[PDB]
Structures are given as structure tokens and as C-alpha cells.
Design an enzyme around this catalytic site. Structure first.
Site, PDB file in Angstrom:
ATOM      1  N   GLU A  72      -7.683   3.491   9.012  1.00 29.13           N
ATOM      2  CA  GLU A  72      -8.243   2.888   7.776  1.00 29.13           C
ATOM      3  C   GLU A  72      -8.113   1.382   7.848  1.00 29.13           C
ATOM      4  OE1 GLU A  72      -7.883   1.127   4.708  1.00 29.13           O
ATOM      5  OE2 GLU A  72      -9.979   1.715   4.436  1.00 29.13           O
ATOM      6  N   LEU A 115       0.821  -1.244   0.000  1.00 31.75           N
ATOM      7  CA  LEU A 115       0.000   0.000   0.000  1.00 31.75           C
ATOM      8  C   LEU A 115       0.826   1.251   0.000  1.00 31.75           C
ATOM      9  CD1 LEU A 115      -2.431  -1.205   2.730  1.00 31.75           C
ATOM     10  CD2 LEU A 115      -2.716  -1.357   0.197  1.00 31.75           C
TER      11      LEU A 115
END
Ligand SMILES: NC(=O)C1=CN([C@@H]2O[C@H](COP(=O)(O)OP(=O)(O)OC[C@H]3O[C@@H](n4cnc5c(N)ncnc54)[C@H](OP(=O)(O)O)[C@@H]3O)[C@@H](O)[C@H]2O)C=CC1
Ligand SMILES: CCOC(=O)CCCCCOc1ccc(OC)c(Cc2cnc3nc(N)nc(N)c3c2C)c1
Length: 206
Positions: free
Chosen positions: A32, A25
Site C-alpha cells: 500500500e 497509521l
């Protein structure tokens, strides 16, 4: 006897549909991730005595997740990969396609099995997302929108927030998102590390 649940996709993506960089990521957002965990783990209380959710993921997503965090904790992991290759897991499941995973799940978690399936999530990556977008049972996307055009090298495969897709995919009211996820969810822009992001739910009709 195999078409007995909708699928949900969950994804964090930039405004340019960016989802990944250099096989990971390219942001660091603990809240999140905690959202992803709450949503993928949430089962209504009455059902929660016997029912669990399923996370389906590509083998490249499987590798992408830090060793510490696998299999993803209180859910049923199934890794999708095209050659019965060599995985090597502690009860961890393997299937050659989305539909083969579904059949493997319904065979394993039947009317009688001690564990029962609540919801099924597709959790990435782009290749598996593309299969899910093409699947007639996918009707829901849990999208975290990241308002920054962060450099990515892998992209979500269909521009479901753009005008060309807007008669098929519709963004739901925040209270409907919270009704679906079973809790209050932050509404509007959240800031961790120099970027605004926010939680969205999109649906289409089957
Ligand atoms: N932002 C977010 O929410 C997310 C981002 N990501 C990112 O996505 C990237 C991974 O994306 P991507 O490269 O597409 O990787 P994928 O995870 O989709 O894995 C691809 C591999 O999984 C197998 N596979 C996928 N779809 C199918 C299918 N329909 N049938 C059979 N096998 C299938 C194939 O395995 P084989 O080669 O074994 O045949 C394929 O090569 C990483 O950067 C990861 O960090 C991942 C999840 C969430
Ligand atoms: C053992 C101790 O465990 C703990 O204490 C709790 C830590 C929880 C970590 C496990 O959850 C993680 C962790 C890292 C990850 O990539 C680093 C991912 C992939 C990911 C991330 N965001 C995601 N967010 C969204 N909106 N969607 C996704 N599909 C998604 C996906 C697949 C998941």
C-alpha cells in the site's frame, strides 16, 4: 493565473473512514505504501524529462512520517502550517494555506524554471483533507479502502463513498484508474496482515 490545475487527494481509509491512530497509521502495509509512492511519483515519459509532482501535507502528517522518509523522495514537498513557525528543511517549503501553497508553487516553478509541475496531490491529514474537500479545484480521490473497522482516533472528514454524496462523487472503472495512474494496478482485494484492502478512484465534476 493560479487556478491552472486540478487537485488530487490520496488516502488510505477504513470502511468507517478511519485514517489514523496515536499520530501514525494503524496498519502496516508495505505494498500500500509502494502504491502511494508509485502514484504520487508517476509522470508520463515524454513530460518526465522536465516535470515532477507535488505532495501537499499538514504539519502533523509531516511529523508522522518517519524521519528516514522525509522529505518524501522524488516529489516537491510543501508542508501546510498556520504560523510561519520553525520547520528547518533542506529546501522544504512552507505555506499557510492550500491556496498559499498553490501560489508559492506557481511563482517558484514557472514557464522558465528548470523544474515543471505535472500533478498536485494532497496527502493528508484530516485537517488538510477537509480544506481540500472544500476547494473548488479538487476533483479526484485515490482511496485505498481497508475492509476492517480498525480503531482510529482521526477520520476522513466527508463520507464521499456513502449515499448522501453519491450524486457528486462517482467511483471510476478500474481500467480508468489504471489509465490515470499509468500502470496495471491490482484489481480487487489485496491481503496483507489479516485485512482485505483495495484500490479505488473517485471523481467529481468541477
Ligand atoms: N491514512 C492515510 O492515508 C493518512 C493518514 N494520516 C494520519 O492523519 C493524522 C494527521 O491528521 P491531522 O491531525 O488532521 O493532521 P494534519 O496533518 O492535517 O495537520 C494539521 C496541522 O497542519 C496545519 N493545517 C492543516 N490544514 C490547514 C489549513 N487548511 N490551513 C492552515 N494550516 C493547516 C495546522 O498546522 P498548525 O497547528 O501548524 O497551525 C494543523 O494543526 C495522523 O494520524 C497521520 O498518520 C495522514 C496522511 C495520510
Ligand atoms: C529512504 C528509503 O525510502 C524507501 O526505501 C521507500 C519507503 C517509502 C516510504 C515513504 O512513504 C511513506 C512511508 C511512511 C508513511 O507513513 C509511515 C507514509 C505516509 C502515507 C503512507 N501511505 C499512504 N497511503 C495512501 N494511500 N495515502 C497516503 N496519503 C499515504 C501516506 C501520507 C509514506
Amino acid at each position: 493565473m493560479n487556478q491552472q490545475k486540478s487537485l488530487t487527494l490520496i488516502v488510505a481509509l477504513t470502511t468507517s473512514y478511519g485514517i489514523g491512530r496515536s499520530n501514525s497509521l494503524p496498519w502496516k502495509l508495505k505494498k500500500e505504501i509502494s502504491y502511494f509512492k508509485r502514484v504520487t511519483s508517476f509522470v508520463p515519459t515524454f513530460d518526465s524529462f522536465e516535470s515532477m509532482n507535488v505532495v501537499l501535507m499538514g504539519r502533523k502528517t509531516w511529523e508522522s512520517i518517519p524521519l528516514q522518509f522525509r522529505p518524501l523522495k522524488g516529489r516537491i514537498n510543501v508542508v501546510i502550517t498556520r504560523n510561519e513557525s520553525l520547520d528547518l528543511g533542506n529546501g522544504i517549503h512552507s505555506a499557510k494555506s492550500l491556496d498559499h501553497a498553490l501560489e508559492l508553487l506557481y511563482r517558484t516553478y514557472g514557464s522558465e524554471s528548470s523544474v515543471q509541475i505535472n500533478r498536485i496531490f494532497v496527502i493528508g491529514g484530516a485537517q488538510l483533507y477537509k480544506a481540500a474537500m472544500d476547494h473548488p479545484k479538487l476533483d479526484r480521490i485515490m482511496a485505498t479502502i481497508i475492509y476492517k473497522d480498525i480503531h482510529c482516533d482521526v477520520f476522513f472528514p466527508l463520507k464521499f463513498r456513502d449515499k448522501e454524496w453519491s450524486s457528486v462523487w462517482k467511483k471510476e472503472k478500474h481500467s480508468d484508474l489504471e489509465s490515470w495512474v499509468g500502470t496495471k494496478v491490482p484489481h480487487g482485494k489485496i491481503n496483507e496482515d489479516g485485512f482485505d484492502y483495495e484500490f479505488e478512484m473517485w471523481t467529481r465534476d468541477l
